[PDB]
Amino acid sequence: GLVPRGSQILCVGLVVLDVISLVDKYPKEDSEIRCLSQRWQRGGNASNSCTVLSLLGAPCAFMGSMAPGHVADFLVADFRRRGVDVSQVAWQSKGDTPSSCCIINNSNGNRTIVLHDTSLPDVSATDFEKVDLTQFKWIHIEGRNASEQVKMLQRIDAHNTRQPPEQKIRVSVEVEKPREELFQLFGYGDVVFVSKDVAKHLGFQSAEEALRGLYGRVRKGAVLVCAWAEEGADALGPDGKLLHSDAFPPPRVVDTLGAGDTFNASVIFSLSQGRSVQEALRFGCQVAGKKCGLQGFDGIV
Amino acid sequence: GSQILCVGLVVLDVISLVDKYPKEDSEIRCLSQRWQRGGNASNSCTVLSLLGAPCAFMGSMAPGHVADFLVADFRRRGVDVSQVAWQSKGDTPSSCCIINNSNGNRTIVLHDTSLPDVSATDFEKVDLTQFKWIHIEGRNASEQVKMLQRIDAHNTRQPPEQKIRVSVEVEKPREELFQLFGYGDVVFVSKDVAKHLGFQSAEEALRGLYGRVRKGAVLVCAWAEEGADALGPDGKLLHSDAFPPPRVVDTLGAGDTFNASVIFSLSQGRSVQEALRFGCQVAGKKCGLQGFDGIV
Ligand SMILES: CSc1ccc(C[C@H](C)C(=O)O)cc1Nc1nc(N2CC[C@H](N(C)C)C2)cc(C(F)F)c1C#N
Numbered sequence: 001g002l003v004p005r006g007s008q009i010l011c012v013g014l015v016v017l018d019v020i021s022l023v024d025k026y027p028k029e030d031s032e033i034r035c036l037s038q039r040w041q042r043g044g045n046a047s048n049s050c051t052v053l054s055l056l057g058a059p060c061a062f063m064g065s066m067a068p069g070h071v072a073d074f075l076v077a078d079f080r081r082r083g084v085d086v087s088q089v090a091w092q093s094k095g096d097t098p099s100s101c102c103i104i105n106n107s108n109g110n111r112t113i114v115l116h117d118t119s120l121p122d123v124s125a126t127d128f129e130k131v132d133l134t135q136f137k138w139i140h141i142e143g144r145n146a147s148e149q150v151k152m153l154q155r156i157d158a159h160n161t162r163q164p165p166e167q168k169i170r171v172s173v174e175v176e177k178p179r180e181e182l183f184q185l186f187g188y189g190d191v192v193f194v195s196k197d198v199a200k201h202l203g204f205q206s207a208e209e210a211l212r213g214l215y216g217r218v219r220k221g222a223v224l225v226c227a228w229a230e231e232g233a234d235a236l237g238p239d240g241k242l243l244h245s246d247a248f249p250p251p252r253v254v255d256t257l258g259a260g261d262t263f264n265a266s267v268i269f270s271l272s273q274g275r276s277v278q279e280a281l282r283f284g285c286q287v288a289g290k291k292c293g294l295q296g297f298d299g300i301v
Numbered sequence: 302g303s304q305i306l307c308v309g310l311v312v313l314d315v316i317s318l319v320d321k322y323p324k325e326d327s328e329i330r331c332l333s334q335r336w337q338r339g340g341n342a343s344n345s346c347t348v349l350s351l352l353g354a355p356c357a358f359m360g361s362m363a364p365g366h367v368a369d370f371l372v373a374d375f376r377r378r379g380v381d382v383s384q385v386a387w388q389s390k391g392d393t394p395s396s397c398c399i400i401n402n403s404n405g406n407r408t409i410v411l412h413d414t415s416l417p418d419v420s421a422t423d424f425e426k427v428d429l430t431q432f433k434w435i436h437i438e439g440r441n442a443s444e445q446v447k448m449l450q451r452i453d454a455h456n457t458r459q460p461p462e463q464k465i466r467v468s469v470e471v472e473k474p475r476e477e478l479f480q481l482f483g484y485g486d487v488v489f490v491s492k493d494v495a496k497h498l499g500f501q502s503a504e505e506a507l508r509g510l511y512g513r514v515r516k517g518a519v520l521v522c523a524w525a526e527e528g529a530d531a532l533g534p535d536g537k538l539l540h541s542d543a544f545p546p547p548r549v550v551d552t553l554g555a556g557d558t559f560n561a562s563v564i565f566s567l568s569q570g571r572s573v574q575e576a577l578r579f580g581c582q583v584a585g586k587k588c589g590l591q592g593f594d595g596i597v
């Protein structure tokens with residue numbers, strides 16, 4: 001249907017079906033046990049961020065590879081259940097959409113994951129070149145196939161050079177997995193989200209150390225953001241002033257799966273509304289902190 | 302009197318085949334993954350249809366994506382689903398099964414969605430004339446005993462040729478299910494129930510539990526690689542060696558393949574010894590294959 005100009009937030013990245021089962025004790029091999037609870041939860045970083053952007057009230061769209069099948073049918077219906085637009089999905093003619101079986105032991109919180117990843121072709125620069133960029137106000141890219149994603153980012157920059165400052169598309173990039181191929185993406189985007197895992201892999205022990213050590217990698221003008229679980233989150237911009245927000249921990253922590261995605265989506269949402277980087281950091285910690293006290297994304301607003 | 306009805310459970314099995322069983326708190330990538338229709342009575346319908354027997358499934362299901370996959374899979378195998386007790390609310394049960402490719406072991410994490418089971422009221426609406434054999438998977442014994450009493454009432458006013466043969470499966474070691482031993486012409490008792498009651502072999506289990514079955518009944522007990530045994534009114538213990546595949550890859554549903562194959566062979570007029578051997582033959586072939594494709 002008709003999407004108004006410069007209204008949607010696009011998240012380019014991964015999607016996975018997690019069939020999560022909570023059990024009294026980890027099952028012994030060749031045995032049948034009944035789980036305490038079970039939920040089929042749609043995952044993936046860009047996918048979870050779309051869920052949160054929709055609940056926060058922002059029109060959003062997901063762009064990622066999916067192959068026709070039972071897993072894709074469940075995931076598409078789950079995207080629609082959360083009000084996410086899926087018209088940009090790169091549908092692959094062969095393969096399986098990723099899915100996993102996660103067993104969580106209630107006795108000690110241990111989590112055993114049996115992942116089924118058929119190495120499905122990622123979204124390419126050719127696929128992204130067919131996307132009409134006018135319907136988007138913000139494009140968030142989850143670091144995955146950096147060499148192709150750099151061409152996607154160069155296409156958005158070309159679009160912005162011939163647009164007034166009001167109609168320019170804001171860009172954010174997430175370097176979450178500690179893969180050396182992804183570190184070229186630091187030099188792209190207006191906002192760069194770096195994970196605690198990437199920071200620790202590169203020898204940084206805190207958000208302050210990570211932002212001071214990695215700011216030289218971002219392009220001129222960019223804001224580098226780093227969330228650090230119970231230690232809150234920090235941001236660093238061109239003025240060189242480190243910004244910080246304390247965490248807003250829930251009374252009881254029940255589920256941190258997707259807390260980083262809730263933080264990213266909430267920082268994007270607040271900045272796309274014209275709020276300052278300090279205000280967006282606080283909002284991101286506030287929404288991600290509330291999410292940690294809830295199972296899934298229901299009730300974050 | 303042409304169809305074989307299986308009353309029991311249907312679940313969606315999300316099966317992951319792995320090189321070795323994963324250690325707790327680890328992340329492993331499986332060799333392959335598939336959505337397969339499961340449940341004891343449901344798997345028996347799959348095998349009865351592949352063996353060439355008209356069959357029907359009776360079990361609780363709730364509308365949704367899981368039920369749509371399961372109904373399409375039942376129709377794909379030529380299984381009649383007009384007897385399904387459709388519930389207005391809930392989700393059809395589902396499970397995560399990890400199958401070790403090195404030895405065919407299967408670990409099941411079952412999610413029973415507390416969906417209402419098939420009741421004696423639901424079964425009372427079933428026209429029994431179109432069935433020649435009715436197999437009931439032990440689940441809600443108090444209600445299933447009323448279903449079994451209804452079939453007995455039907456048989457009392459039928460000539461011996463038009464009587465419906467009945468089989469019962471006591472698979473889970475639940476004390477409430479042991480009342481079902483005294484019902485049916487064939488009673489299938491699992492190795493788990495036998496070991497729970499202190500029996501160390503199929504011979505011990507059949508001698509120790511035959512007093513629980515009704516007069517005339519045949520008690521059957523499969524014992525994985527040790528074959529299977531049966532005991533009838535004549536008191537003669539019958540045995541069949543297993544037909545193990547050279548490489549065991551998937552034992553999920555081997556017991557269901559055994560039960561369906563023993564029912565199929567007996568419904569064709571074969572002896573209890575012939576049915577025991579056929580059950581071991583088809584279940585043994587299934588252990589060397591992923592799923593039920595290729596068992597015939
Ligand atoms: C600033 S919001 C944020 C942003 C990204 C992340 C995820 C990322 C992986 C990371 O930074 O670790 C997390 C959060 N936030 C929390 N994460 C938590 N954990 C994460 C795993 C830890 N284990 C299980 C010991 C616990 C606990 C809390 C707690 F205070 F309620 C909060 C909050 N509030």
Ligand SMILES: CSc1ccc(C[C@H](C)C(=O)O)cc1Nc1nc(N2CC[C@H](N(C)C)C2)cc(C(F)F)c1C#N
Binds near residue numbers: 528529580586588
């Ligand atoms: C007599 S046929 C039969 C009838 C009922 C069952 C019961 C079982 C619980 C099931 O339903 O899987 C199993 C079988 N048969 C086999 N089971 C095997 N298991 C290895 C360990 C597995 N554990 C207990 C789950 C089971 C291995 C083999 C091997 F020789 F190939 C065969 C055969 N033949």
